[PDB]
């Protein structure tokens, strides 16, 4: 994969709620440093909600791929609400941009 | 409705297949200039497939909003494939970025 494009994807779609760097802060979501090979729900200092902890799954390329591919199946209600809030704002911003750009 | 954020979303999520500018090129998808207030399937010069045309739907703020919220209502199988191909590439670039950034 192209890490430079992946960086832009991460900024746009995740960085509002997650940091990746060693010792980076917990925000809406947990810091993700050390994620690869860690069991779900094991970021130190982050208060997970009921669903995430009870998996027994190890994060890696393949589990991330399945996670991202059908998030609704696996994300808990809390994150679903936060994500839906961000997606509603993104839609309104996109439509705002389109009504400007396509009529300029 | 933040037009500048809307632009960034458009670049990331749509600009591979769409232009918005007057006289802008048709690419995988139709140029979008003048979209608002136009019926579905009426971009001049563009070769559509069946499942979009002859709707009688007029594009606007609300129909665009529903499109983004419920794409199954509007996107044909052809576009589903193009978008699914794109999302897979996105997932691989994001995962590649994460395996670098979360291990730095
Ligand atoms: C962009 C595509 C991403 C990616 C790759 C991830 N997120 Fe999130 N995340 C958020 C919250 C509140 C949680 C915890 C939910 C709970 O309490 O159980 C998470 C959790 C994750 C994980 C699991 C981490 C673990 O340590 O087990 C992963 C891998 C993850 N996220 C990746 C919050 C958000 C958002 C808030 C609106 C947004 C946007 C994202 N996350 C985006 C992404
Ligand atoms: C980013 C979220 C967007 C937005 C806002 C739109 N698209 Fe696409 N698009 C693609 C193709 C092949 C078509 C034609 C499908 C067919 O033959 O019917 C479209 C169509 C649209 C429309 C309808 C346009 C019309 O004139 O009726 C609209 C409003 C629209 N798009 C907006 C192809 C793609 C992609 C290829 C992988 C990508 C990505 C997008 N479109 C993204 C977006």
UniProtKB/Swiss-Prot annotation, chains A, B:
Record-level GO BP terms: apoptotic signaling pathway; cellular respiration; execution phase of apoptosis; intrinsic apoptotic signaling pathway; mitochondrial electron transport, cytochrome c to oxygen; mitochondrial electron transport, ubiquinol to cytochrome c
Residues reported to bind heme c: 14, 17-18, 80
Gene Ontology annotations for the cellular component aspect, listed alphabetically: apoptosome; cytosol; mitochondrial inner membrane; mitochondrial intermembrane space; mitochondrion; nucleus
Effect of residue 10 to Y: No effect on covalent heme attachment
Modified residues (N6-acetyllysine): 72, 99
Similarity field: Belongs to the cytochrome c family.
Protein name in the entry: Cytochrome c
Lineage, broadest ranks: Eukaryota, Metazoa, Chordata, Craniata, Vertebrata
């Amino acid at each position: 994969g192209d890490v430079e494009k992946g960086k832009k994807i991460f900024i746009m779609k995740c960085s509002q709620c997650h940091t990746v760097e060693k010792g980076g802060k917990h925000k809406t979501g947990p810091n993700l440093h050390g994620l690869f090979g860690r069991k779900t729900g094991q970021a130190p200092g982050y208060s997970y909600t009921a669903a995430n902890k009870n998996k027994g799954i190890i994060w890696g390329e393949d589990t991330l791929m399945e996670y991202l591919e059908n998030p609704a199946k696996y994300i808990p209600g809390t994150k679903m609400i936060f994500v839906g809030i961000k997606k509603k704002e993104e839609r309104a911003d996109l439509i705002a941009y389109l009504k400007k750009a396509t009529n300029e």
